[PDB]
Amino acid sequence: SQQVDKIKASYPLFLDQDYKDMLAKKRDGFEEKYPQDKIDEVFQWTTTKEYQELNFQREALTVNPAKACQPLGAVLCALGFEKTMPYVHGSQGCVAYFRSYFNRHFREPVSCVSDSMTEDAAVFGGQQNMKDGLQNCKATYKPDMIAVSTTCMAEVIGDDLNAFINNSKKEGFIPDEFPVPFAHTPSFVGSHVTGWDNMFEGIARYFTLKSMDDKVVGSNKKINIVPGFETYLGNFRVIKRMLSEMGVGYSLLSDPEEVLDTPADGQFRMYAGGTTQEEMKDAPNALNTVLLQPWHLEKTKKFVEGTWKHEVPKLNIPMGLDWTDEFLMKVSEISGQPIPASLTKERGRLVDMMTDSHTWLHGKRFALWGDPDFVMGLVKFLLELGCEPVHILCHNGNKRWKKAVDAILAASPYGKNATVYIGKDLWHLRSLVFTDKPDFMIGNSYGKFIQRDTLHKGKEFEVPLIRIGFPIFDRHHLHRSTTLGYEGAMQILTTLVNSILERLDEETRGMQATDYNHDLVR
Template sequence: MGKKTPDFVSTTNACKLCRPLGAVLAFRGVAGAVPYLHGSQGCATYMRRYIISHFNEPIDIASSSLGEKNAIYGGGANLKQGLKNVTAKYCPALIGIATTCLTETIGDDLNLLLSEYRREFMAPDDSSPLLVRVSTPSYAGSHMEGFHGAVLALVEQLAAPESPGGGDEKAPLNLLPGLVSPADLRLLKEILAQFSLPATILPDFSETLDGPALDDYPLIPAGGTAIAAIARMGSAPLSIEFGRTLPDRLSAAGWLEERHGVPRRRLGLPVGLRETDRFLSLLAELAASGEMAPEQAAARGRLLDAMVDGHKYLSGQRAVVYGEEDLVVGLSSLLAEIGVRPVLCASGGKSGRLAAALDEVLSELLPAGSEPPEVYEDCDFFDIAARARELKPDLLIGHSKGYHLARELGVPLIRVGFPIHDRLGGQRLLHLGYQGGQQLFDRLVNALIARKQDDSPIGYSYM
């Protein structure tokens, strides 16, 4: 597999977003929570812009609003005043506090500052909001590391020791799906209900980042994972965690296994047929009936039928896939299943596990003797564009930041993942399960049919 060997140190059009942005998304998936950035106001404004453009939902991100003076004297006073203001205005159940480049660089001791705040301003009873902190300097990592770091922080700081009688098989499962769409989260909840398996999903922003129209604007939207449910995660019979490339140091399921003895099962994102089969086979094993939910068996059959109907349009096509590492792995698995060859798989992440994860899912799918995809980790769109011009793919699959490259190459861009800021409905895209595979398959086929029609001098009106 190919490997990027950069001869420069600057980044041109990054293939990732900043670390505290990922933490904000994770905290937004907790009931009654307000995300809070310990840093400058500009950081919060930038992140609000990115999140709103994808989800088309309002989002408040509190900030300690540090200025030049605080870069010298520290941001402790601003942090405390900001927490007091948020508590008074929002009455949150939890404030998720993420650091930024500025506060990490000047060396603010967040643990010490929050200890002082609790002693000076928080009520001795339970009326004050919980404070959960996570270190997220943008210069070290991507939005995915910030997301997983915040999930780990929530578990570390809220999950209580196993209660007497813990490990009861009737206790909810833990499901840690990673950064997927609100539509994906709703689908996961439907699937779990079809198997009659109660579960705590962390985080759950299926409603908080994709809610209904309301007469009044709520300061904190309804929905999210209940804090009491997070506290009980140490008593679960099993944790299911999606992410073949997730580092152990950021694994909330790994921490629960180590500290509370909760067994962990790690799977790839259930994108496409085989990866979804692995997930649903596990659910069938855990379900009381021990069988596949009939709704899912029917969805699988429909996906197979679609693959038979549309394979002639996709067979032999070549794709460049980019985005978050685990999404790239899942998408590449789906593409190989339907006859599309991933020629370049790229990510701004740098777990060091992308190439091995791709080899694991593609080894049984690629035809014998075929070339595996080139793999770029810790890359930007300068790297991706330079190689894509040489590879001349038939399509690009990834988020909106690849639009200009797709336009230059004259190939379709299938928009998936985050961020999608040049189309409506990014929060409603399905990626997971047989249903998500069905939608992605249809979009791929139709994009290639449209290109053939557009490029034809006469066009055609029937498949």
């Protein structure tokens, strides 16, 4: 029964007395539910150190992972080029899931096609499917370029994408000059960042391998920028803005910002902006190549150093204060352009915020997780702010990354209690935050559930979540934020300090109980 004037959605409609009685009758009559005391006992046992010791003994079971498969990153990398339709050689459910994931994150249309391989393709293969898919994709959704990736199914059957595409071109199914790069992206190896790396390396190979004879390093006076797997449009915009302010000539070799932020003016645009094929062809002529996220760009770095002969600098992700300064200085050294006064003023403004907010960020324990480069930059920034990470997690991190993070932590007096984990899911993190309670979590929307469990134990044990990463599903338009450079550091500092202050305000709102510390000025 809903009143017409005040219509209730599922909440709080299902809190009505009749609905509560119906649910109670359903629970008692037929659910055969365990007694509530047993449930509480099991929960309390799960919140203990013994349960953590059992949890970290896991070898085969993974609960609530914090990563995705390679083809997702491959699709994102493909979306970064001009009129390049991401085409995945494999089953269609994958592509559907990729599209749903990206639509839920960016809240924008995402274009991705599949050849819809089926049980017939398991035995025979995926040659005819590849030919038909290429022809239909070029006829119906006209692109200037088609990027070909693979799902696990195509990898297990051991397809031969190069041979299939060559046969398709040969047997009158597509023009022999139509750009069709490809990459092998097994979903059971690495994660989505590895898929992005493989896709970018395949595209660069396809566009530059056979024309290195006439390429002179530095003949165009430009610096190539490879952003890697990035999910914030603000980072793409801020990198270009800073490079333009320095006056350096640049070529962003992956720019999906335009297609992922198209305006709603009454018409639908399937393609928008992106890196042109001419830029990819002229890339070997650049002065150098700078990798924004050097950890999940190993294959790209190998290809660039081996083939393009560019000497890629060893630069960390430009997150925080020190690494942004290092990136700016390295770019100035490579291009010769002096650092303008606007960037100096912006750095000073960031230092002003750091000095103003330092009394609230000091001695705050944070538990983070996410991509390797993003997590490393966030840890560096937290160490710079005086915050002490306690639980640094990265599901798809390797041992060298852990060594680097440990080296970073050991260089500061605030990495004393920090523990790095590589290969642990969010159940391990739940146990860690239950037994060694931090002040806040910093991560994607999945930690949203952890904050619920920590609330069930008690209000005093709750660990608030700060949504900085990929994917974010329960907050609108957070993908427009910035995390790279000085602007991205200012936004992150503001988010952290305001979250701390909001939690403090919530804790001190009880009237005549804890409201004595409900200060107007903080």
